[PDB]
Design a protein around this ligand. Structure first.
Ligand SMILES: [Zn+2]
Ligand SMILES: [Zn+2]
Ligand SMILES: [Zn+2]
Ligand SMILES: [Zn+2]
Length: 252
């Protein structure tokens, strides 16, 4: 097999020689965040893999809740396991929200630079957010509310000015060797101002969703779960040689 989703017998083809690792957001998991994007990439011939991270005992389905440094270590082990199995030298990473930000910890402090070619962030909180902003996720994930507080570490670590965010962004945003893409939406209600999602460096491409389609009004959750315009742009970043401009026509 040269395509699949969590199929560890998958072997990346010559057209798509790097396997893709998908990294969910806050309150997400390896399956539900990626019900549209994973098949979408499988149909374009990628070997796709998705991990669970930040699990809290007694809270199935809703992850990204444990300490984000520990989450980055889970990502570390998971990428090694995907590379050990596929044979490939490097993986490409796609992440939504927390999952677009957390891999920068792996890249910067756990030697992920070696093992990663590209990091694509969809609505990533790259310089953190507020607890108030994170509460705007709750209507999409009701039932998680009773198991969390302001001290839930996966939430507190995302707060702009936290010890975690301070450590992560003390130096520059990027690490040499890696191609970074950020896809943001101006209607983001969770991570504001939305420009703080953007990365800075020589090898960064920041993209505003509404530049691609002016009438795509996706907010924070939609952009990383169901938005095919966003996902077309993800497919461009994963294979820049065969990229084609993303317009409203990608909505199907
Ligand atoms: Zn499910
Ligand atoms: Zn899970
Ligand atoms: Zn390692
Ligand atoms: Zn920065």
């Amino acid at each position: 097999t040269s395509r699949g989703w969590n199929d560890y017998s998958c072997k990346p083809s010559a057209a798509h020689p790097r396997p893709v690792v998908l990294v969910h957001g806050t309150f997400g998991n390896s399956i539900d965040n990626w019900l549209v994007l994973a098949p979408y990439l499988v149909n374009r011939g990628y070997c796709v893999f998705s991990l669970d991270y930040g699990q809290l005992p007694g809270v199935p389905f809703f992850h990204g809740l444990g300490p984000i440094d520990k989450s980055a270590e889970q990502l570390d082990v998971f990428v090694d396991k995907v590379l050990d199995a596929t044979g490939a030298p490097k993986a490409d990473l796609v992440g939504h929200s927390q999952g677009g930000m957390m891999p920068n910890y792996y890249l910067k402090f756990l030697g992920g630079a070696d093992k990663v070619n590209a990091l694509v962030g969809i609505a990533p909180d790259n310089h953190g957010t507020t607890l108030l902003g994170l509460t705007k996720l709750l209507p999409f994930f009701p039932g998680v509310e009773k198991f969390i507080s302001d001290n839930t570490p996966g939430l507190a670590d995302q707060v702009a000015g936290s010890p975690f965010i301070t450590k992560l962004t003390a130096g520059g945003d990027t690490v040499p060797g890696v191609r970074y893409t950020v896809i943001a939406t101006k209607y983001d209600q969770v991570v504001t101002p939305y420009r703080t999602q953007y990365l800075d460096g020589p090898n960064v491409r920041n993209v505003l969703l509404q530049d691609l389609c002016p009438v795509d009004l996706s907010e924070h959750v939609a952009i990383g779960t169901i938005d095919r315009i966003a996902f077309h742009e993800v497919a461009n970043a994963l294979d820049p040689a065969r990229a084609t401009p993303t317009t409203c026509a990608s909505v199907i």
